[PDB]
Design an enzyme around this catalytic site. Structure first.
Site, PDB file in Angstrom:
ATOM      1  N   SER B 161       0.821  -1.218   0.000  1.00  0.00           N
ATOM      2  CA  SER B 161       0.000   0.000   0.000  1.00  0.00           C
ATOM      3  C   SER B 161       0.850   1.260   0.000  1.00  0.00           C
ATOM      4  CB  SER B 161      -1.357  -0.175   0.714  1.00  0.00           C
ATOM      5  OG  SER B 161      -1.582   0.326   1.988  1.00  0.00           O
ATOM      6  N   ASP B 256      -9.479  -4.585  -5.720  1.00  0.00           N
ATOM      7  CA  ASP B 256      -8.649  -3.549  -5.155  1.00  0.00           C
ATOM      8  C   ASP B 256      -8.833  -2.294  -6.002  1.00  0.00           C
ATOM      9  OD1 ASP B 256      -6.697  -2.022  -3.864  1.00  0.00           O
ATOM     10  OD2 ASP B 256      -5.008  -3.302  -4.502  1.00  0.00           O
ATOM     11  N   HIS B 286      -7.909  -5.978  -1.300  1.00  0.00           N
ATOM     12  CA  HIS B 286      -6.748  -5.253  -0.807  1.00  0.00           C
ATOM     13  C   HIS B 286      -6.494  -5.638   0.659  1.00  0.00           C
ATOM     14  CE1 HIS B 286      -3.923  -1.813  -0.825  1.00  0.00           C
ATOM     15  NE2 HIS B 286      -4.252  -1.768   0.473  1.00  0.00           N
TER      16      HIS B 286
END
Ligand SMILES: CCCCCCP(=O)(O)OCCCC
Ligand SMILES: CCCCCCP(=O)(O)OCCCC
Ligand SMILES: *[P@](=O)(CCCCCC)OCCCC
Ligand SMILES: *[P@](=O)(CCCCCC)OCCCC
Lengths: 315, 315
Positions: B161, B256, B286
């Protein structure tokens, strides 16, 4: 963008070409076979020790199919997750010996059993003999899993060149026949499209190992005249549906005619919602995956492929 | 469309939302942090044993940078090939503890040393504090390689991320400053484009873990108002040149928002002639890379990433 070690080997091949060794594209494919096969054997790095090697055979569609099994080091379990490997060489040359060192190294690294298949070669047996043996070998090993000391739950196929082609077809064939197909497909610089010419097929038609002259020599042997080129056994890239195919590892090389159609196939898989791994090794040639005496990149690739399959089956 | 294990977890999160009185989107950043950090710790699968763990710190740009080293099992060599890991959490939440289990599992599988970094968080320290610590940590560990028991020749970075973003930036920054950068970059579902909204950013804006509401909450804390969004520290995808960047592993998830800009970055790398590995895990969300108490796929991904890096450094 060509690597030193890659460029080095290309110098050697250029020396030999222009100094007695004819290349000649000798059509006595039966004669040329024996010469090149010996070169291929030498091209492979020295073979790593394994736990156990086993030679055997079984009944195919039209003949006995020979095979060799490699059991990896310090792997005590009876039934192991197993890869079925189809050698490369334009459905004309190669055999178990030309890819022995590579299979040994794959099994060790992956912590998986490897089963090299020795399928019918052309011209002696043309299309579609080779892939018919490829499919029969999978079906047989699947159905007699425990006999072959193999977990049926974690059974895969793979190869390089014609071998990689042959692997991708076995998976489609199984889905088309609505039967249980492989759990994983390892496709190394495979040929997936006979129907047209990509950019790379033109851009690297001459001077980088695999030559357009070579591909014709193979083609004239493998393929009977007037065979529909949009056949999926020749061109699995042209499949309508890509859903329901197994998770894939796909590797391409930077200076490979079969580069663009390789990545194309990988892309078709990603958009079909299949779990896929793509990789490009820039600055090396087609065939580096088993010219591991000359190209370290080959050994790195041998390790990477083995590793991704291993992680999939959780070995 | 989704996996069972993925669908399962999504409904539980949906239980709390109306079932109890939650809502991170509606909390003081410093308050919410403490609550969610504990949840993250629990989300991780139980930690595997390693050979050795070591805590330490050093002088950063503006503060002490804490760190933790994991030495993998049965690895006797002094200097090991080493990965520098930046935790995820929108440059606002997370710490070494929230990603401990994952780092342990990575080091074991990869047969490499792992060095988790604890970088300055927002809002307390906003842009560009976090990535400044990210860059300083790499430069330090590079220049004092043997001190950190690390082979300088085989030194890598990675994260998830914001962490994956931070990793990709460290590599660019180094190339831009014309100094020795990392040997390998492991980019896990990273955010690479702040300048616009991809298809996936819209298509999965709500209901699949990461919410558009979450990303705003983070954004308002991290980023001073009226900052040019085409800054490469916010949007490294918009870089002119991609050549001279290190070999990459890039992973995306099917559901995601950061999917499309993830694969985009990977593609920019492949066409720049860099050695790249892309992978998509369809039918997971995600954050699955460290919610390994709920999602097996996460552990498979943990293994796959570790394996590709390992094979690269030849461990
Ligand atoms: C002489 C070097 C070539 C070795 C064979 C590579 P692969 O089997 O090529 C497949 C192409 C299918 C016609
Ligand atoms: C509630 C789940 C939090 C997961 C954080 C994922 P990463 O930090 O995403 C970066 C955000 C970009 C501004
Ligand atoms: P291939 O690329 C041979 C190209 C000539 C085709 C006939 C027109 O062999 C490469 C050998 C290494 C230099
Ligand atoms: P965000 O994607 C939206 C909040 C729930 C609305 C359901 C459509 O956060 C999702 C968390 C899982 C329910």
């Amino acid at each position: 963008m060509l690597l030193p070690e890659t460029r080095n080997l290309l110098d050697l091949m250029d020396a030999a070409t222009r100094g007695g060794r004819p290349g000649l594209d000798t059509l006595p494919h039966a004669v040329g076979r024996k010469a090149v096969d010996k070169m291929s054997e030498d091209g492979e790095a020295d073979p790593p020790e394994v736990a156990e090697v086993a030679n055997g055979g079984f009944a195919g569609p039209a003949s006995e199919i020979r095979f060799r099994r490699y059991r990896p080091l310090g792997e005590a379990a009876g039934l192991l997750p197993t890869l079925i490997y189809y050698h490369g060489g334009g459905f004309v040359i190669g055999n178990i010996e030309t890819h022995d060192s590579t299979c040994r190294r794959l099994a060790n690294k992956s912590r998986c059993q490897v089963i090299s298949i020795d399928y019918r070669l052309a011209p002696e047996h043309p299309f579609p003999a080779p892939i018919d043996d490829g499919i029969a070998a999978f079906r047989h090993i699947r159905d007699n899993a425990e006999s072959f000391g193999a977990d049926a739950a974690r059974l895969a196929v793979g190869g390089d060149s014609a071998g990689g082609a042959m692997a991708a077809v076995v998976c489609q064939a199984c889905r088309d026949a609505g039967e249980t197909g492989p759990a994983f497909q390892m496709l190394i610089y495979p040929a997936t499209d006979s129907s047209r010419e990509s950019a790379s097929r033109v851009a690297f038609a001459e001077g980088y190992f695999l030559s357009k002259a070579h591909m014709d020599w193979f083609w004239e042997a493998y393929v009977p005249e007037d065979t529909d080129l949009t056949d999926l056994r020749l061109s699995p890239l042209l499949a309508t549906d890509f859903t329901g195919l197994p998770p894939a590892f796909v590797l391409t090389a930077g200076y490979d005619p079969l580069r663009d159609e390789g990545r194309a196939y990988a892309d078709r898989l990603i958009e079909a919602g299949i779990k896929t791994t793509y990789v490009n090794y820039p600055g090396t040639i087609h065939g580096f995956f088993s010219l591991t005496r000359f190209l370290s990149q080959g050994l790195k690739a041998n390790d990477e492929a083995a590793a991704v399959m291993g992680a999939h089956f959780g070995t």
